[PDB]
Amino acid sequence: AGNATEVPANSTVLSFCAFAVDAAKAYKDYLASGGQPITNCVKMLCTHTGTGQAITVTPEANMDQESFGGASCCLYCRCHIDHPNPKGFCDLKGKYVQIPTTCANDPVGFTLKNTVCTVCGMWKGYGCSCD
Amino acid sequence: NVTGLFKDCSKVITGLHPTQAPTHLSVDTKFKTEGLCVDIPGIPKDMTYRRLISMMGFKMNYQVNGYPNMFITREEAIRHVRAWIGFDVEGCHATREAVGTNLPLQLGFSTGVNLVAVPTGYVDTPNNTDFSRVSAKPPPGDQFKHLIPLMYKGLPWNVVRIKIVQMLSDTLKNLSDRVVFVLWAHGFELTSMKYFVKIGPERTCCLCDRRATCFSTASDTYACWHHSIGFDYVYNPFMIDVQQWGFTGNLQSNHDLYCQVHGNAHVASCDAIMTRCLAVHECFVK
Ligand SMILES: NC(=O)c1c[nH]c2ccccc12
Ligand SMILES: [Mg+2]
Ligand SMILES: [Mg+2]
Ligand SMILES: [Zn+2]
Ligand SMILES: [Zn+2]
Ligand SMILES: [Zn+2]
Ligand SMILES: [Zn+2]
Known about the structure:
- The structure holds two protein chains of two kinds.
- Chain A contains four helices and three strands.
- Chain A has helices spanning 11-19, 23-32, 75-79, 107-113; strands at 55-56, 65-69, 96-100.
- In chain B, helix 4 (251-258) packs across helix 5.
- Chain B contains five helices and 15 strands.
- Chain B has a domain at 74-119 and 136-284: Nucleotidyltransferase, domain 5 (2-Layer Sandwich).
- By secondary structure, chain B is of the alpha+beta class.
- The chains are: A alpha+beta, B alpha+beta.
- Chains A and B meet through helix 1, helix 2 and helix 3 of A and strand 2 and strand 11 of B.
- Chain A: Zn(2+) 7 binds at residues 74, 77, 83, 90.
- Chain A: This is Non-structural protein 10.
- Chain A: Residues 1-131 form the ExoN/MTase coactivator domain.
């Protein structure tokens, strides 16, 4: 009874991060010890003519990015654990997240390490037009 | 190839919207094409769902620098016999809004303690995972009849985990710098530990040089068994599954080969006492 959501290639990393006090640090450490990044994300097919903004209602990848379903790039959504936001709610679930193509092999790690500019809506260091 | 870990136990026929699905498998078939997913204009997100996610099937076989192994060898367990605490959990089944997973109901230890929890699960919603009470029932059968009154005597998990830490701390503070949970068929015991265990690198206590055995979500601090009053999580416990030592039949039949004083009173604590007792007889007697 029920429907599977996951593949065996993610069992170890998700189990490790589901028990950690600090899930983000556990994910970083798992990768540094030679572990594979989380796979089975929701990658979208799109026209690559989008705005390039980081977090959007519909896919907005430009030619330097890929678009993914938001929840699938969120470590806290993937491990079904508490979000570190004040009210425990997610900022990626229910949106699409644009990830630079050079980082698209590890969308979960990308969202953990990076920050969205609130002025222009693009990732700091990967599109932000403010600095 | 799929795993049962994080299986969606809801009864909703369809899968999720691409923005809400945690994984490609969980996206509804209607969005899948050309090896990936597409956003379909006019097909909205679901803003009211509650999908129970199964915590059966954890695999703690990672090898990460600075994080200790949870499962230990028989030789290591023998050196830490003073840290042995038998542990068994009797579960109840998800029902009504969900089906296909076991929830902890009666948590039993070789100290003779049984703690009863409210049936609680991990429910995904449009905004987060809600750790919450879920509909449940004991498994059917005369051997599970004793669990019926426990369905309404449970304590919330925030109280149960404080009681587990207090019990372990009182029992072990003068015996060991750690705990070794002695298990028989560990799958559901490991699923139950998700509710009261946290892991990380080896740490020291907030008030001494001893290794940390407890963690507090109140202050994000660590404590040994002496300084853990009020602490809510067991931190970096160790464990061993006795069944993996070459036994063939059930727990009771193997326990009874060496011991006669522990009659089966059919309860989580009794199974926890039998498991520790069998391990002690196998490793230290004759
Ligand atoms: N029939 C199916 O594959 C599914 C229906 N609902 C789901 C939820 C999560 C994963 C898969 C499914
Ligand atoms: Mg068992
Ligand atoms: Mg039992
Ligand atoms: Zn999330
Ligand atoms: Zn900017
Ligand atoms: Zn201490
Ligand atoms: Zn015995």
